[PDB]
Amino acid sequence: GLVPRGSHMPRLQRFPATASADEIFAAFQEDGCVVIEGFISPEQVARFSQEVDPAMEKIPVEVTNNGNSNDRTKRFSKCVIASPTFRNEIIESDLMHELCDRVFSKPGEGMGYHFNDNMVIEVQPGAPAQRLHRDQELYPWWNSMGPAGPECLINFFCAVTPFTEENGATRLVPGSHLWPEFTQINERDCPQFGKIETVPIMQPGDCYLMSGKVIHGAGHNATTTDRRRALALSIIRRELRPMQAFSLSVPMKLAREMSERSQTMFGFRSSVFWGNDGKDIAHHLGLI
Amino acid sequence: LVPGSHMPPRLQRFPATASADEIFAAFQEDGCVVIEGFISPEQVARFSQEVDPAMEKIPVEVTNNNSNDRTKRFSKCVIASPTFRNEIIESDLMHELCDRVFSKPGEGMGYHFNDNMVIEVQPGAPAQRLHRDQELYPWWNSMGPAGPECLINFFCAVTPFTEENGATRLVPGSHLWPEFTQINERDCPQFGKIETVPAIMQPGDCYLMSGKVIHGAGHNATTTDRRRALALSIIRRELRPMQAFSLSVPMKLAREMSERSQTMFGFRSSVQHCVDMVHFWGNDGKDIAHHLGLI
Ligand SMILES: C=C1[C@@]2(C)C[C@H]3[C@]4(C)C=CC(=O)OC(C)(C)[C@H]4CC[C@]3(C)[C@]1(C(=O)OC)C(=O)[C@@](C)(O)C2=O
Ligand SMILES: C=C1[C@@]2(C)C[C@H]3[C@]4(C)C=CC(=O)OC(C)(C)[C@H]4CC[C@]3(C)[C@]1(C(=O)OC)C(=O)[C@@](C)(O)C2=O
Ligand SMILES: O=C(O)CCC(=O)C(=O)O
Ligand SMILES: O=C(O)CCC(=O)C(=O)O
Ligand SMILES: [Fe+3]
Ligand SMILES: [Fe+3]
């Protein structure tokens, strides 16, 4: 009795941040995405939002009407440089790694994943809805492999300020990771274009774990006041190249304080790729 | 020529002064092609001499195996060889061809370095399993021959490549087979029935080879010949390199590279387009070359 008996049915499962990893993962497989409510302790999600606000204030807003994803949407990636909670607390969630290890790692080969980006995405008010897309369009041949292709990218998309249907929370399309052809989503290339059934709604600290095969896009921010802010944990196979060059921007001072696993996530350490003439790059960097 | 003898596959050969279009047409037809004189014999000889110390301090690994042993493999060529970083990586024919393979309209450089490896096959070294280089990116075979290119290799003879000292065994036209499998008895139906052909080359020659081409280092049946190679391994901008070059190459060497050589090693970004644009391997909307001070 979830929709009125007889209704058309719109599946967007939700789990507590305290459930098992296999539980959350099974929802990921079946739907392509899933919500983790309280993925981040609320003091953290709050101390974090404060910590990056000054960097966010020095980001001018584009009012372009050119269809961009930069039109009235603020984007900021130096989260580890500018936020102690982020680099010390958020990136060390064992749920994150336990799930990454289930999407990506092969047995006896160590961590099969690393970071692509740490973006804070703040959808400004009056911002047009973002073009629909699969995140794996970042790796342009991936769509060519269809839903039998391996996973390349997952996104722990975390709500900073509340995600309403009015302030433009992300429009998901669960199950589009099993459609038989992966196209771009436009009138010329997508046959279902205009008939794609979206499904929007989260509180500060929640997140959703979306596959890279899943169609989505930020909605229109219809409000006058609400700067709707997010923090996306983009994580990729170790064979793929990060969009952010973190091991050259993030200073060595911060890297020495990270875990072995987090140095691996930012490329300050190698995995069984990105080495140094037959040896781990961590030797040459001063990290034993 | 040979006497109704069985005729092997054609490995096409071009001098480094042929047009990049003529060389690329062969690469596209066969998946591989020799470029005679890719490096000058003077340039290669000084490279071989500039790396030789680090090469002698490399111990030969001998094992009780089918292990890919008794092969020295050295990757710090930029740090050890002025000739390599000043001249070899500035081959305009190398970049012409990379562009024709990897670069998209309006995006700039579609490619960068995966590795710069001196590969010295020792006397008696066993032959290498037949493989495609794109098995490094394990999902690539599943796209088959219609797949895009992920990797090409400019595989240079530093010392002569003979059939007896272990010149690479190549399979022209294996990039057009309808199914790409690992070359094992379990998965490959042509296992044991695959005809290869050596890359007979003189020093400074190279062959350009697709990641789709089946190949393997040959057996070095000589007693004296240490068969040296320089592998310039080039991948598309979205793939991760084997070597963390931007972290082990010193900035002093970085600041002295052309801007395309900085891009090759990750000291500089390239622009990818999706209506959207982004600097791949970049710094919060800016080319990484800013934060590093490279203008
Ligand atoms: C250029 C863009 C790309 C190509 C990549 C994309 C990226 C890395 C994609 C997937 C991902 O896993 O993680 C995040 C959430 C960090 C996003 C961040 C935003 C950008 C950098 C991007 C952009 O800023 O465009 C002006 C876009 O908004 C978008 C969706 O159009 C893209 O596909
Ligand atoms: C581990 C190996 C990998 C996975 C990669 C491969 C690599 C990067 C492949 C492609 C390439 O373009 O560059 C070069 C030519 C430099 C080679 C160098 C040698 C190694 C590092 C490798 C190895 O050392 O095996 C003992 C191999 O020989 C082989 C065939 O098993 C592989 O496919
Ligand atoms: O901000 C959002 O709601 C989604 C943005 C997104 O998916 C992207 O930038 O790739
Ligand atoms: O040494 C050779 O000739 C072949 C090397 C090779 O194919 C590899 O290491 O991948
Ligand atoms: Fe997205
Ligand atoms: Fe090879």
Numbering used by the authors:
A (entry chain B): -3 to 6, 8 to 197, 199 to 270, 280 to 295
B (entry chain A): -2 to 0, 2 to 63, 65 to 273, 275 to 295
Show passages lifted from the paper.
AusE (Mr 35,100 protein, 314 amino acids) and PrhA (Mr 35,121 protein, 314 amino acids) are very similar (~78% amino acid sequence identity) αKG oxygenases that both accept preaustinoid A1 (5) as a substrate to form divergent products through dynamic skeletal rearrangement. Non-heme iron and α-ketoglutarate (αKG; also called 2-oxoglutarate)-dependent dioxygenases are widely distributed in nature, and play a major role in diversifying the molecular scaffold. AusE first desaturates at C1–C2 to form preaustinoid A2 (6), followed by rearrangement leading to the formation of the spiro-lactone in preaustinoid A3 (7). In contrast, PrhA first desaturates at C5–C6 to form berkeleyone B, followed by rearrangement of the A/B-ring to form the cycloheptadiene moiety in berkeleydione.
To understand the structural basis for the expanded catalytic functions of the PrhA mutants, we also solved the X-ray crystal structures of PrhA-V150L/A232S mutant in complex with Fe(II), αKG, and its substrate (3, 5, 6, or 7) at 2.25–2.3 Å resolution, as well as PrhA-V150L/A232S/M241V mutant in complex with Fe(II), αKG, and 3 at 2.35 Å resolution. On the other hand, AusE and PrhA-V150L/A232S mutant first abstracts C-2 hydrogen atom to desaturate the A-ring to form 6. Next, AusE and PrhA-V150L/A232S mutant catalyzes oxidation of 6 to form the spirocyclic 7 through radical rearrangement of the A/B-ring. Here the C-5 atom of 6 (5.2 Å) is closer to the Fe(II) center compared to the C-9 atom (6.0 Å), which supports the mechanism involving initial abstraction of H-5 by the Fe(IV)-oxo species. Subsequently, the spirocycle formation can proceed through two possible paths. Path A involves radical rebound to form the hydroxylated intermediate, which leads to deprotonation at C-9 and migration of C-1 to eliminate water to form 7. The lack of potential catalytic base near H-9 and the stereoelectronic problem regarding the syn-arrangement of the migrating bond and the leaving group suggest that Path B involving homoallyl–homoallyl radical rearrangement to be more plausible.
